[PDB]
Amino acid sequence: SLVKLANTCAHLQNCSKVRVALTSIPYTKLQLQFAYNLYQQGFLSSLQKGSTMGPDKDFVEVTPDNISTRRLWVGLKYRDNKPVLSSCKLISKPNSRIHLPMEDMKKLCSGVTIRNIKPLQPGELILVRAHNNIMDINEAISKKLDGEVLCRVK
Amino acid sequence: PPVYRLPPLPRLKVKKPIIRQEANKCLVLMSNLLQCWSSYGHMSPKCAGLVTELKSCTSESALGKRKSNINYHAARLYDRINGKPHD
Amino acid sequence: DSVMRKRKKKMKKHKLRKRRKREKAERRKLSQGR
Amino acid sequence: ATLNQIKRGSGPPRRKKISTAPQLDQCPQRKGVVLRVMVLKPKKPNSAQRKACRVRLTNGNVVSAYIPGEGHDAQEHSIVYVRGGRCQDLPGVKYHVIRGAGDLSGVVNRISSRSKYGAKKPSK
Amino acid sequence: MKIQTNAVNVLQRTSAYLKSGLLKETPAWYNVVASIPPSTKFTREPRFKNPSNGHIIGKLVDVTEQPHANNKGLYKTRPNSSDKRVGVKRLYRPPKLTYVEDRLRSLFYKQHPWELSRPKILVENEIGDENYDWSHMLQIGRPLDGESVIQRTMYLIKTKQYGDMVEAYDHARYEFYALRMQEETEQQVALEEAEMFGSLFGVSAIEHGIQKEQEVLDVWEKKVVEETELMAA
Amino acid sequence: LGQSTSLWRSSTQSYIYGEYKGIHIIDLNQTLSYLKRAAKVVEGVSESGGIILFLGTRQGQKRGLE
RNA sequence: AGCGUUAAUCAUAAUGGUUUAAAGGAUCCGUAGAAUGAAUUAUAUAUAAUUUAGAGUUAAUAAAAUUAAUUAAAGAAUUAUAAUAGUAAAGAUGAAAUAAUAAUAAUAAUUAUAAGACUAAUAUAUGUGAAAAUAUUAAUUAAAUAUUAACUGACAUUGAGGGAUUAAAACUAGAGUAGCGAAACGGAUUCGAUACCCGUGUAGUUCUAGUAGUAAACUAUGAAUACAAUUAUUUAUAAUAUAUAUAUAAAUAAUAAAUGAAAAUGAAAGUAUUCCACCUGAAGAGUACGUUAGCAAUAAUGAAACUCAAAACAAUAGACG
RNA sequence: AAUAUGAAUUAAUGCGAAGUUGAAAUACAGUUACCGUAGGGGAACCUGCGGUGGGCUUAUAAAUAUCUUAAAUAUUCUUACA
Ligand SMILES: [Mg+2]
Ligand SMILES: [Mg+2]
Ligand SMILES: [Mg+2]
Ligand SMILES: [Mg+2]
Ligand SMILES: [Mg+2]
Ligand SMILES: [Mg+2]
Ligand SMILES: [Mg+2]
Ligand SMILES: [Mg+2]
Ligand SMILES: [Mg+2]
Ligand SMILES: [Mg+2]
Ligand SMILES: [Mg+2]
Ligand SMILES: [Mg+2]
Ligand SMILES: [Mg+2]
Ligand SMILES: [Mg+2]
Ligand SMILES: [Mg+2]
Ligand SMILES: [Mg+2]
Ligand SMILES: [Mg+2]
Ligand SMILES: [Mg+2]
Ligand SMILES: [Mg+2]
Ligand SMILES: [Mg+2]
Ligand SMILES: [Mg+2]
Ligand SMILES: [Mg+2]
Ligand SMILES: [Mg+2]
Ligand SMILES: [Mg+2]
Ligand SMILES: [Mg+2]
Ligand SMILES: [Mg+2]
Ligand SMILES: [Mg+2]
Ligand SMILES: [Mg+2]
Ligand SMILES: [Mg+2]
Ligand SMILES: [Mg+2]
Ligand SMILES: [Mg+2]
Ligand SMILES: [Mg+2]
């Protein structure tokens, strides 16, 4: 869900503000994907499944017995007295969800304000959902996927 | 027991530090004499030495002999003694 | 509203009340039968 | 300010200018007939004797019009044209009699700013 | 207090100045600070073990990991309320260090109040230099006290001479007692010897105490008389 | 031996090892590494001929500081 | 070869706000919502089958005796009447008088009857209630906390319109009426005194049945969810080997960060998401007209003309009291 | 039926002019001020009832404190001693 995603973004921002190292997130698929995307772009130092109490050392299979207590632990990242993941504003908010075609995404990438989105920035990452798979907006353009403009990290 | 923490104050100070001195000797003698004269009629010689002692005390002046650094410690140690959280 | 600002409002309300008191008989006359 | 609220009528207040001269009826001038011609005391703090006049326009509504320039020529019936200026010190007068036209004559021995009054070019 | 940027970014700020020409000459520290960079990464780092005990902080016991019946014979089939709450503050708040020896220490001084009266120097000598075999109590650099007993108990526990802790403690206590008795006898006999061979002690401990009391009493007496006089009048 | 459990600036959390006797205890391996780093920079500025200034306002510190 | 001026149009700040400046509905309940809202997999934002983390249901085990409504009790005093004995003042105020005060024998005192209305300590409104509210006692009926066990399987959030409750005053009936007390009258005060003080003291305050639906109905701060750095206090829960030092929550008080016009807010006035209400210069105005509702007072709804370049808040330094 | 214009007389309100009567508010504004409401008064206002602080969180003591080798030992010590 999108509300959840917004909440996790807010939590990430809060954690960046006070400089915590290792932070929990809810264990869902969308959320996990988002976390993986951040990790690959280079905003998170670590990403690992775990309990509500802490990250897991060994593998523990997730079932109806565990699922309520399961959690996604995430390492934050800092360099020269400045946090890497400064912001996590989402674009498609729950009330005004926005879905762009490939042309619109291209325009956004090339410095054009679209549907009241400030076009994407030098060291920024706009994530895009396309058939329940979160991608970079550039990646989506390359693959040519009309998708929901999810969120924005800087 | 019930502890009572104050808020952050501008300045911990007592407005009138008492330096509870001892009471005056001459005054005491005078009171004793008065007490003696309550009994034994007006001026009997049971209080013959007491009157003399009083006179000796109150010859140069009516009283014989003529401050606590407490709010120099409060002021000093307020910032320490606070449970004021960090900056 | 500060107290000073409120005082203008209060005054206005008082004036209105006075006007209503004055125009009671007139109001009664106007109301009944029309 | 919620998205739904905005949809059902909410937003910034669009500042659509407002008519400085309503009685003029959305046009540059209107002809009028002077009724009386006054000498008004201005507001505090500035003092003079302002040569205003009362004018019934052709559209019907009556207006307190200022008369600029030195000495003027206006009776109790003169044809006078009104424009939408405002005499700032006199309250309740939101108009000027335009001075070259009508029975109101051009202001005499005017050298500077002649078109602002009636004054013709002296022609050596 | 906000994380100060300007205490650790000193060389960068000076490097900029040098580039500009605001600074003609480089500082003495500049090269040194370049060589040895500051930390500048003021994070809250999480901790997963209590160092004293060796308990695990991070882990959660699952429903599948608790198959057998609970106290009051109910099988756990669900996560409880506490198993759902996100326990992140435990990872970050520093661990309360616990030792088995602390309890033994507490017990000993309850059992032996007058061992508290034996003065204790807390100013450490080289902690690395020592090398005590707790086969016995009497170590060289260390004095005889409840601590030594406790160390002996711990040694016994480790070696499994006494498998039970209580028995080991008792044994250590009994070892201590004999030593204490011996110490007591030593001093008395030394005193006796001194008395025999014409040694002269100017002030004995009890005499000293009496003298100390006397001054206080004298102070009290004058004050008390004054107070009585006050009361009379 | 760190300050106290109730006088805690949580900014310093990474440095502290655990709490004991109602007192935060400073991780001492960390202390060592920071000391070494500090010692090296002190040596470096002395080598370069820099002005080192030792500031110590507490009561007993004067003689050792001098 | 136009330049002025007037009349107009577009641009020129919502890349806004509502504790204190315009602006949170008195409070909750709940309908619509073309408002928003968990998990996993598979179908070609939906369907389908599975989940239990939200939201509920019922037990069990601990606690708590509070809030409603109703019925039945308690108490210090107050006034009034009467008796007793007793003597000249009493009562009041800044100081005085007027009065159902007193030589018809008072006031004070001691008794003895009656009447209403109030609830000293404990008390912190701590707590409890949706908010109005709510502390003498008891009973009845209703509702209420936490943790476990089991079950339901997103059933939720917010909520236009709507609905219900809503202090004090007011009103309509019928009781009641000690004390207090608008008005009125009288005495003072004062240049005056339609006041502040004193005296008589009617409505009212009290109960029963209603009407009405407003208050600085205020935390001047709508509700919900997720999240973020410390400390100290209590409160409850669990374990500990009943009294220890521990783990949880909850509240209260200081703060970090952050936000902020600042004052300051501090788990919200922070970071975010959702939903509703409301604001768009000051006067004129919550006025007029109109409509609806009310026994009525009134309540809600709610304009325009005319006139200004004002008007407002936080804080600063003075002067002043 | 609705709308528009007119109406003797009459009410509110604005702007100007600073006249008269008081002195209600701002300080403890000389009776704390304001909310709701009711009654009264030339006029500001006054008075009852409950509410609010945007007025008092402006908050700041009933006082007494202890014994071990005072030194040939501590106090000195400049990478020494071990
Ligand atoms: Mg306001
Ligand atoms: Mg010219
Ligand atoms: Mg700050
Ligand atoms: Mg615009
Ligand atoms: Mg409200
Ligand atoms: Mg609701
Ligand atoms: Mg509420
Ligand atoms: Mg009470
Ligand atoms: Mg009645
Ligand atoms: Mg009266
Ligand atoms: Mg009533
Ligand atoms: Mg009703
Ligand atoms: Mg009202
Ligand atoms: Mg309000
Ligand atoms: Mg506070
Ligand atoms: Mg902000
Ligand atoms: Mg604000
Ligand atoms: Mg009305
Ligand atoms: Mg008709
Ligand atoms: Mg007329
Ligand atoms: Mg006068
Ligand atoms: Mg007065
Ligand atoms: Mg006063
Ligand atoms: Mg006054
Ligand atoms: Mg006053
Ligand atoms: Mg007054
Ligand atoms: Mg009156
Ligand atoms: Mg009042
Ligand atoms: Mg009340
Ligand atoms: Mg109230
Ligand atoms: Mg005030
Ligand atoms: Mg104040």
From Swiss-Prot, chain B:
Q: What else is known?
A: Present with 259 molecules/cell in log phase SD medium.
Q: Which BP terms does GO give this entry? A: mitochondrial translation
Q: Which cellular component appears as one GO term in the record?
A: mitochondrial inner membrane
Write out the function statement from the record: Component of the mitochondrial ribosome (mitoribosome), a dedicated translation machinery responsible for the synthesis of mitochondrial genome-encoded proteins, including at least some of the essential transmembrane subunits of the mitochondrial respiratory chain. The mitoribosomes are attached to the mitochondrial inner membrane and translation products are cotranslationally integrated into the membrane.
Q: What's this protein's family per the entry?
A: Belongs to the mitochondrion-specific ribosomal protein mS37 family.
Q: Which parts of the sequence form the motif Cx9C motif 2?
A: 47-57
Named from the GO MF annotations, one term is:
structural constituent of ribosome
The protein's name is Small ribosomal subunit protein mS37
| Coiled-coil residue spans | none
Domain of life (superkingdom):
Eukaryota
Q: Which cysteine pairs are covalently linked by disulfides here?
A: C26-C57, C36-C47
Keyword annotations: Disulfide bond, Mitochondrion, Ribonucleoprotein, Ribosomal protein
Domain CHCH residue range list:
23-65
Subunit relationships: Component of the mitochondrial small ribosomal subunit (mt-SSU). Mature yeast 74S mitochondrial ribosomes consist of a small (37S) and a large (54S) subunit. The 37S small subunit contains a 15S ribosomal RNA (15S mt-rRNA) and 34 different proteins. The 54S large subunit contains a 21S rRNA (21S mt-rRNA) and 46 different proteins.
Q: Where in the cell is it found?
A: Mitochondrion; Mitochondrion matrix
Cx9C motif 1 (motif): residue ranges? 26-36
Q: Which gene encodes it?
A: MRP10
UniProtKB/Swiss-Prot annotation, chain C:
Q: Where is this region: Disordered?
A: 5-34
The biased composition feature labelled Basic and acidic residues covers 23-34
From the Swiss-Prot or TrEMBL record, state where the protein is found: Mitochondrion; Mitochondrion inner membrane
Superkingdom of the organism of origin: Eukaryota
- Segments of skewed composition (Basic residues): 5-22
Biological function: Component of the mitochondrial ribosome (mitoribosome), a dedicated translation machinery responsible for the synthesis of mitochondrial genome-encoded proteins, including at least some of the essential transmembrane subunits of the mitochondrial respiratory chain. The mitoribosomes are attached to the mitochondrial inner membrane and translation products are cotranslationally integrated into the membrane. mS38 is also involved in the splicing of the COX1 mRNA.
Q: How does it assemble?
A: Component of the mitochondrial small ribosomal subunit (mt-SSU). Mature yeast 74S mitochondrial ribosomes consist of a small (37S) and a large (54S) subunit. The 37S small subunit contains a 15S ribosomal RNA (15S mt-rRNA) and 34 different proteins. The 54S large subunit contains a 21S rRNA (21S mt-rRNA) and 46 different proteins.
- So what family is this one in? Belongs to the mitochondrion-specific ribosomal protein mS38 family.
What is the name attached to this protein's record? Answer: Small ribosomal subunit protein mS38
The record lists the organism as Saccharomyces cerevisiae (strain ATCC 204508 / S288c) (Baker's yeast)
Q: Which gene encodes it?
A: QRI5
Curated annotation (Swiss-Prot), chain D:
Broad class of where this protein is predominantly found: mitochondrion
Biological process (GO) annotations held by this record are: mitochondrial translation; translation
Q: Which GO terms label this protein's molecular function in UniProt?
A: structural constituent of ribosome
Instruction: List cellular component terms (GO).
Output: mitochondrial inner membrane; mitochondrial small ribosomal subunit; mitochondrion; ribosome
- Where is this protein localized, as stated in its record? Mitochondrion
- Protein origin, superkingdom: Eukaryota
Keywords per UniProt: Mitochondrion, Ribonucleoprotein, Ribosomal protein, Transit peptide
| Function statement | Component of the mitochondrial ribosome (mitoribosome), a dedicated translation machinery responsible for the synthesis of mitochondrial genome-encoded proteins, including at least some of the essential transmembrane subunits of the mitochondrial respiratory chain. The mitoribosomes are attached to the mitochondrial inner membrane and translation products are cotranslationally integrated into the membrane. uS12m is required for respiratory growth.
Family statement drawn from the similarity comment of this UniProt entry: Belongs to the universal ribosomal protein uS12 family.
Q: What else is known?
A: Present with 238 molecules/cell in log phase SD medium.
On assembly, the entry states: Component of the mitochondrial small ribosomal subunit (mt-SSU). Mature yeast 74S mitochondrial ribosomes consist of a small (37S) and a large (54S) subunit. The 37S small subunit contains a 15S ribosomal RNA (15S mt-rRNA) and 34 different proteins. The 54S large subunit contains a 21S rRNA (21S mt-rRNA) and 46 different proteins. uS12m forms part of the decoding center of the mt-SSU.
The residues of the intact protein that this chain contains are: 29 to 152 of 153
From Swiss-Prot, chain E:
Q: Which UniProt keywords apply?
A: Mitochondrion, Ribonucleoprotein, Ribosomal protein
Location relative to the cell: Mitochondrion
* A GO CC term assigned to this protein in UniProt: mitochondrion
Function according to Swiss-Prot or TrEMBL: Component of the mitochondrial ribosome (mitoribosome), a dedicated translation machinery responsible for the synthesis of mitochondrial genome-encoded proteins, including at least some of the essential transmembrane subunits of the mitochondrial respiratory chain. The mitoribosomes are attached to the mitochondrial inner membrane and translation products are cotranslationally integrated into the membrane.
PANTHER family tied to this protein: 37S RIBOSOMAL PROTEIN S25, MITOCHONDRIAL, SMALL RIBOSOMAL SUBUNIT PROTEIN MS23
Assembly information from the UniProt record:
Component of the mitochondrial small ribosomal subunit (mt-SSU). Mature yeast 74S mitochondrial ribosomes consist of a small (37S) and a large (54S) subunit. The 37S small subunit contains a 15S ribosomal RNA (15S mt-rRNA) and 34 different proteins. The 54S large subunit contains a 21S rRNA (21S mt-rRNA) and 46 different proteins.
UniProt miscellaneous comment: Present with 1920 molecules/cell in log phase SD medium.
What is this protein called in UniProt? Small ribosomal subunit protein mS23
